[PDB]
Paper text:
We have characterized a new influenza virus from a flat-faced fruit bat (Artibeus planirostris) in the Amazon River basin in northern Peru. While our phylogenetic analysis indicated that the Peruvian bat virus shares common ancestry with recently identified Guatemalan H17N10 bat viruses, their genetic and phylogenetic divergence is such that we propose that their HA and NA genes be designated as new subtypes H18 and [name], respectively. The influenza HA and NA proteins are critical for interaction with the host and determining the subtype of influenza type A viruses. We determined crystal structures of the A/bat/Peru/10 HA and NAL proteins expressed in a baculovirus system.
The extensive sequence divergence of A/bat/Peru/10 NAL from the recently characterized N10 prompted us to determine its X-ray structure in two crystal forms at 2.68 Å and 3.0 Å. The [name] NAL forms a typical “box-shaped” tetramer, containing six four-stranded, antiparallel β-sheets in a propeller-like arrangement. Comparison of the A/bat/Peru/10 NAL monomer with other NA structures reveals surprising similarity despite low sequence identity (29.6%). In addition, a calcium required for stabilization of all known [name] and B NA active sites is conserved in [name] NAL. Among the eight conserved charged and polar residues that interact with substrate in all other [name] and B subtypes, only Arg118, Arg224, Glu276 are conserved (N2 numbering) as in N10 NALs. Arg292 and Arg371, critical for sialic acid binding, are replaced in A/bat/Peru/10 NAL by Thr and Lys, respectively. Furthermore, only three of eleven second-shell residues are conserved in [name] NAL (Trp178, Ser179 and Glu425). The [name] NAL active site pocket is much wider than other flu A and B NAs, including 1918 N1, due mainly to 150- and 430-loop movements. The glycerol moiety of a canonical sialic acid, as observed in other flu A and B NA structures, would clash with the [name] NAL active site. [name] NAL catalyzes extremely low levels of sialic acid cleavage as observed for N10 NAL, and similar to H18 HA, [name] NAL exhibited no binding to 610 diverse natural glycans including sialosides in a glycan microarray assay.
Numbering used by the authors:
A (entry chain A), C (entry chain D), D (entry chain B): 82 to 138, 149 to 152, 156 to 170, 170A, 171 to 196, 200 to 307, 309 to 330, 333 to 337, ...
B (entry chain C): 82 to 139, 149 to 152, 156 to 170, 170A, 171 to 196, 200 to 307, 309 to 330, 333 to 337, ...
The structure:
């Protein structure tokens, strides 16, 4: 048993390939499955797991469960993770760390299935996890937690975790903006994170940091707006797009030699998902845009987020993402499911997946 | 490939958070689950397991001992068959699971791995009774307590030491004047410490501590915060039995430490809610105080409760947890049990309901 | 991996404990379970397994299956083992060796699930396995196969196997008698086996041999008749009681410090099962008869055999036995299931298990 | 821990014995079980596995799964592999490589369950995997992919895979024929494949190649026609039998000291499977043909393919095959399942295995 360590260099990405299309490909989800909520994917040294929150088939009776990515959320296949309605998890090579918001809005850290730490609100609660995979590398896990009673006065903290106990935190300067649900990936000695501004920005705030918690917030300079809601696409500039900048939904950008922005196509009817390659940094006006894949056209789209398969010693680090989709049960209840794409260096055709 | 060894020093505890919460705590248990009873938790050096005795399905497969990995539902797919019996205790020494199971007319079979390695028989009439809880293993040897006698008014109890599934000798315990059923135990500071249940003449709970040389002393809590159910009104502090409503009782625990705890059922009438009270100092002085009463559960109907220590740690202190058995109902309407578990936090918690 | 290797010394046995009781020990088999016949138990170095033959819920349709001892034979819990109507198995530390009679009556030998040898009838056919766990020790496996068109003129061969392959064999002088379904065990450098005489004996014959094939048949000098059917019990004499010596059923004896013989108590209706202790060998006439255990009463019983749980490091080799019981399904179909008992050094109360 | 490396020399084969026989061969299929299609068998260093494509209990709702050979395709024994309707797989000693076709018809390579590469058509698609085990030896894996919109103008490529990454491919000259669904085996420094010609040949095209991609297409010189459909068997000649050469179904030949050709007995009602021994090469007009085994009699037959077990210290390389058969579930939906045969050194009696 050895610490999970990710790749220093990303695989080159030129397109995306489905690795899972959830139980609603038939149009409807089987009623024996749990009503699933706040879905995200995280990977260990041996598998990828689907984590979500559920009650049955904010409440005192929501739990965090996981199944193996690809297994359907039936009673047989469920693993109880924690009590809570907001969760983040990640694996370090030894054990799952699961961060969960429960009770009056504090977070409990479970390692294996043992409480290793709790964290309590300080700016008025409730605490909010990043609702996405956290990042473990070489024995340490990193995560981001939000406090504050309004998005207009939110506070954000960067946590480092060792075997599930807090090894410290750092206040992030988020003056002038809001930074919810950061979804992250590791590369070249940095964790890089895309968050959601529910207050004043139709673009997404960006964050990178290293293990010394030296950090930088960045604003994407591209008029292709990532948030939903949002207005008309703008010319390229380096500061915030404030128009329709209130509200928002979890989503991601990828910054690399090729950069990407994934977004909901129609902000009004939350229908369709597109992801768009750019030749260069998200943070220059001069960068151009090379290819836009319409991955979904007909499904209604909720949250989306990044994940890194890690069971590897390979020459190149793979990158994936999940999308939470509005679904309907056979009986006719509203629910979600979850689809996943993974990167490829191969240039892909135009295929609509749903 | 090494003997399980527990921390000599317990972590500080000032609060409790759930680690597992069965579906029946917040609604109906799914019908595909095995109906469980006599639940308890025991941990190895790799995982925590939920041991239990089955009652079948929605009228089917009963009478046996099973385990699942704690966190997993008792669906057919997740069941490890363990032994034949209606009553079991288990423990793990680093090598294999030891399982004490009562069967037949009340003899105890001992299984190490799945291998029968010993058998224990009643002197004083039977039927024999396990502690219905985890046994304690440390550094190769495992300890457990077994009850004999036909009435709670004439109960005998024995301390058993076990190596690799075989009996490495035993001591008769002096329980003259009280009853000591279903002890739940923990290890710290060189002693095994157990909390028993007196179904005869005490509404407080009897206490035991002992080392590997079978040097024991039984203690009696000097606290008027009455641990058993049933029970009467809370009393003044005094250092002997509360005989009033001391007949009957349910398995439950006390924690003795720098900080002490008593967990009990809140309404002894309708068996509703569970509380755990922190005490500053020992359970065995009349001066020790009373600091914070946590009302962990309110909604649900409580039964047995027990202690367990996880030991797949690489932690600098020994963690302590407890399990609470809950009366619940299946989707079909059959009544059944499951489980909530709690482990200690070093920091104080808010007043919150967990079930 | 490493080779499976047993204890040279048997644990003392003064009593018997049930390790597993089927659904049809306790009344009626559910209809979703397979219809097992030819049940027996063989152990590996990690688990004991229940092997049987089934056909649905001599035929081409017959297959060999197995489950983990304890698991019910629901389709979900089944492992296909071979095609056949007769089977012996055993584990060498590396792989399950499985002998199966199939086709016209040749035995196929599977190692893993790959065929490593075939054995064909010379003396008439069809061939017949020992219907019971064969024995493996130190990388090498031993079994006994029978040929002959009738039990009068039956031939018996002793096979040595390594990794699934015939490593030579030996003919056994069974002039005089018949040696069907030997059920065996190992100690003291010898493999001791108990056969069923369907010809001229209502006692059970007895084999022992070493790894270098030196063997001797012995006759129990004992008037406690083990085979079924049988006559009234007799005084002790060292010759075959030929009285209702025709007919027969699979069963065992144990030779040791204490020695045992189990049998169906009533050969009329085949109800109840008893097992009886003796203070010394079965092959002296002078040997007493101590405690008799009435393990089963109201149940109509059938085949029984031996197995040695082989996953130790130990001061003693455990020894067990299975009993095959007639049973009924919820729709009223006739079928079987299985109960097991293991030894324990101490004496046991008089308990009736069904 | 180490690369899987196969045996340079085949076992002597003079007969076949079943090692798995599905429940639907000998009756109806339990409806708990998944509805398998495109079944085939691939082996690792530890086990043989049954791969297939299913929907539930060019279709976009399909996925690739697998179970261990011998277990049933019940939910508990299931394993998700990939999205897609067409799959090939092989193990290298480290990880499963799985080739899957999805979307409009590109292929994805998964290694572990991690996406490691894609492959794209340039001749119009969809792409088609060999629908059978691909071949790994000494760390590198080989597989063959088909492209093109008619079989009249089909196109084929031979890929070299290393840890799930493409290390190159070579065009195969299939001028004047079609080469679908090759099913292959390894010996004597060569990979040998039997294909299916849907265009202009009732015999089966054959292909051998070495690790440096030197290859030779051969036509079998035997008038015992391998494909279905086909016409009247003819005389031995060394080129295509064009009549009834349109259409076809996946199947195999074996080239050895003893050669074999397995085929469906009745081309019209696809019932019965036979396999014919030839004393020598499939590629001389002179070679003769000795023993014909009628293996299956009752069953309706479809696809058939080769696989080689590698969990072994045999002294000689074993060869097996699987046959997909039409079947019905208890509730009477059409499905398939599987019978597998492995080679034995001895000659065998004429038994009906299904
Ligand atoms: C302990 O029990 C309390 C209270 O018990 C409640 O009353 C008892 C007398 C008994 O009848 C119980 O069955 C009953 O639950 C539980 O606290 C309740 O928790 C539920 C669910 O979280 C809350 O129900 C919600 O009420 C909202 C407005 O008051 C309403 O907006 C919600 O609707 C939403 O969800 C429903 C599905 O349930 C959906 O249909 C709607 O469309 C919408 O999404 C919902 O109905 C109660 O408010 C709570 N009651 C009180 C007084 O606190 C508690 O959960 C339980 N604890 C545990 C851990 O089991
Ligand atoms: C977080 O958890 C990990 C996993 O338990 C801890 O890593 C472990 O650290 C200990 C201390 O070095 C190691 O134990 C020692 O291992 C060496 C060599 O194997 C041996 O010589 C010693 O006798 C001792 O057993 C252990 O190997 C290592 N875990 C592994 C397998 O990598 C880590 O210490 C924890 N971190 C903190 C701060 O609690
Ligand atoms: C039956 O199968 C078993 C398992 O495959 C065979 O046992 C194997 O024997 C070979 C040679 O005797 C062993 O190889 C050697 O291993 C030792 C270390 O133990 C190493 O020092 C040598 O360099 C060499 O590699 C092999 O380990 C062993 N397998 C195991 C797991 O024990 C056996 O030979 C087979 N029977 C026959 C006679 O074919
Ligand atoms: C209980 O079982 C364990 C494991 O089988 C035994 O530990 C082994 O003891 C032997 C004999 O001294 C050593 O050779 C091994 O190295 C030990 N194994 C390990 C992993 O420690 C132990 O001896 C047994 N205890 C008794 C008293 O029987
Ligand atoms: C393909 O995968 C194997 C397995 O990971 C690689 O073999 C490893 O090679 C490195 C470098 O020498 C060693 O550190 C590992 O110990 C090897 N693994 C094992 C278990 O043998 C192999 O190098 C890979 N090939 C390429 C080029 O990717
Ligand atoms: C192939 O078909 C025949 C005909 O149905 C099967 O033969 C029957 O088998 C059963 C049980 O073995 C017998 O009771 C019948 O008497 C047989 N009928 C005939 C006409 O032979 C045969 O079993 C089938 N083979 C397989 C393996 O499915
Ligand atoms: Ca916004
Ligand atoms: Ca009491
Ligand atoms: Ca006889
Ligand atoms: Ca053709």
């Amino acid at each position: 048993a050895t610490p999970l360590v990710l790749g220093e260099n990303l695989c080159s990405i030129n397109g995306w390939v489905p690795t899972y299309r959830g139980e609603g490909t038939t149009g409807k989800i089987p009623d024996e499955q749990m009503l699933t909520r706040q879905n995200f994917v995280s990977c260990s040294d041996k598998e990828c797991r689907r984590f979500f929150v559920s009650m049955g088939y904010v409440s005192e009776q929501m739990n965090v469960y996981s199944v193996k990515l690809g297994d359907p959320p039936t009673p047989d296949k469920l693993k109880f993770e924690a009590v809570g309605w907001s969760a983040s998890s990640c694996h370090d090579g030894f054990q799952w760390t699961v961060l969960s918001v429960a009770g009056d809005g504090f977070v409990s850290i479970l390692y294996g299935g043992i409480i290793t730490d709790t964290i309590h609100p300080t700016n008025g609660g409730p605490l909010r996890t990043q609702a996405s995979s956290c990042i473990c590398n070489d024995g340490t896990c990193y995560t981001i937690i939000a406090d504050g009673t309004t998005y207009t006065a939110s506070s954000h903290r960067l946590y480092r975790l060792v075997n599930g106990t807090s090894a410290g935190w750092k206040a992030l300067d988020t003056t002038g903006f809001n930074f919810e649900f950061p979804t992250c990936y590791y590369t070249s000695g940095k964790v890089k994170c895309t968050g959601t501004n529910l207050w004043n920005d139709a673009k997404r705030p960006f964050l990178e940091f290293d293990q010394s918690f030296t950090y930088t917030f960045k604003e994407p300079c591209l008029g292709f707006l990532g948030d939903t809601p949002r207005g008309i696409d703008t010319t390229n500039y380096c500061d915030k797009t404030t128009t329709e900048g209130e509200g928002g939904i979890q989503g991601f950008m990828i910054e690399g030699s090729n950069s990407w922005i994934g977004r909901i196509i129609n902000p009004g009817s939350k229908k369709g998902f597109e992801i768009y390659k750019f030749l260069g940094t998200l943070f220059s006006v001069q960068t151009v845009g090379n290819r836009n894949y319409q991955l979904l056209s007909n499904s209604t789209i909720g949250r989306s987020g990044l994940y890194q398969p890690a069971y590897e010693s390979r020459d190149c680090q793979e990158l994936c993402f999940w999308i939470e989709i509005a679904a309907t049960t056979k009986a006719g209840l509203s629910s979600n499911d979850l689809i996943t794409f993974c990167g490829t260096g191969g240039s892909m055709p135009d295929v609509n997946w749903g």
